[PDB]
Structure 1
Amino acid sequence: DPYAKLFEERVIFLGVQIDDASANDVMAQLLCLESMDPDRDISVYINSPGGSFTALTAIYDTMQYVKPDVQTVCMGQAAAAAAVLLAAGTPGKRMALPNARVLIHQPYSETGRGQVSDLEIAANEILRMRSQLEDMLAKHSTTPVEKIREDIERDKILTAEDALSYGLIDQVISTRKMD
């Protein structure tokens, strides 16, 4: 079982849509890794297309609360919440594969049939979510918040070099022989 061996070396895979079950599993694994060793690095690999905002906030808070440094590595794609999780790693320890893509855009949501007051409350809530999103993106990046708002207006796709210049990641690792 390769996943068990990976977990034995403090490595966590996130290659599924970010929902409640996956968030709970990730948080439980993070708590176990902290309990077994509170002062050694934890590696998180991201290959997910995105997910719900509440699970994203839960995972982000769990990563921030847990004190050992978290090294985030992007392998395939990191879109929406996956980009935020990738940028939420320890500075200097955020990496991406040479051929990878990072996708950022403003949140999208659906609501059911309802009266105007409920719709207004939902609109206020989603605007609050979006504002929290720009705050989270600006905190862990080297880009002004106004540029963040202008960029995440539509779908923004960045390669490894574009992400490195954009501040989400810190290194592009080519091979193993060439350190």
Structure 2
Amino acid sequence: IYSRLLKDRIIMLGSAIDDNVANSIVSQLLFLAAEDPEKEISLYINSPGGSITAGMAIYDTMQFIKPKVSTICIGMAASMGAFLLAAGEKGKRYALPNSEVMIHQAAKRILLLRDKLNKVLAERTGQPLEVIERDTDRDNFKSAEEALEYGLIDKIL
């Protein structure tokens, strides 16, 4: 069934996040580039969470091709999918009016990531780092509407 989806340039991502699946999406993204350079694309999500290493693995590639990328959320969305959520163009990041989002987290390597990560997410919104930190270690489930003020999303339908 996943195949027949792909015939009009749509993807799904809901199970979990490892390295094995990570190789699939990148490959999926790469096939879709070499058939046309400009046919718009979307992305649908319903995630539990994930590791840290692949979060850049996808963001770098998404920032790489000829065409653009849109994003959509569904219900639950974790720390990782959140970063993926605010990754397409600014006014193509829709959601649903029942959805939750959260934010949450071989040594000297990683400390570059948690800082590099915040640099992105605190620059697409304008919100400064002081807002980020105390709201990044904790766990408080925002909603659809209040997230818009936070600067993750443009216009719920």
User: Match of 1:101, SS?
Assistant: coil
1:39 aligned partner: 38
Which structure has more strand as a fraction of its residues? 1
**1:23 alignment partner AA:** A
Determine which structure has more spread, i.e. the larger CA radius of gyration: 1
Where do 4+ consecutive residues of structure 1 move more than 3 Å?
Answer: none
Deviation for aligned residue 1:100: 0.3
Supply the distance in 2 between the matched residues of 1:80 and 1:166 (Cα, whole angstroms). 15
Higher mean C-alpha deviation, range 142-151 or range 6-15: 142-151
Deviation for aligned residue 1:156: 3.3
User: Match of 2:122, SS?
Assistant: helix
Give the unaligned 5+ runs of structure 1: 108-120, 174-179
Supply the distance in 1 between the matched residues of 2:124 and 2:22 (Cα, whole angstroms). 21
Supply the distance in 2 between the matched residues of 1:5 and 1:95 (Cα, whole angstroms). 24
Matched, 1:146 2:130: yes
Deviation for aligned residue 1:129: 2.1
Supply the distance in 2 between the matched residues of 1:156 and 1:30 (Cα, whole angstroms). 33
Deviation for aligned residue 1:140: 2.6
The RMSD of aligned alpha carbons is 1.5
Matched, 1:159 2:138: no
Aligned counterparts, 1:64-143, within 5 A? 64-105=63-104, 107=105, 122=107, 124-143=108-127
Aligned counterparts, 1:11-50, within 5 A? 11-50=10-49
Deviations 1:69-107 (A, max 9, x none): 1111001211111100011111100011111011112x2
Identity fraction in percent: 52
How many equivalent pairs are there? 157
Supply the distance in 2 between the matched residues of 1:169 and 1:67 (Cα, whole angstroms). 23
2:153 aligned partner: 169
1:117 aligned partner: none
Q: 1:141 to 1:16 in 2, by over 3 A?
A: farther
Q: 1:151 to 1:93 in 2, by over 3 A?
A: same
TM-score, length basis structure 1? 0.81
Q: 1:126 to 1:136 in 2, by over 3 A?
A: same
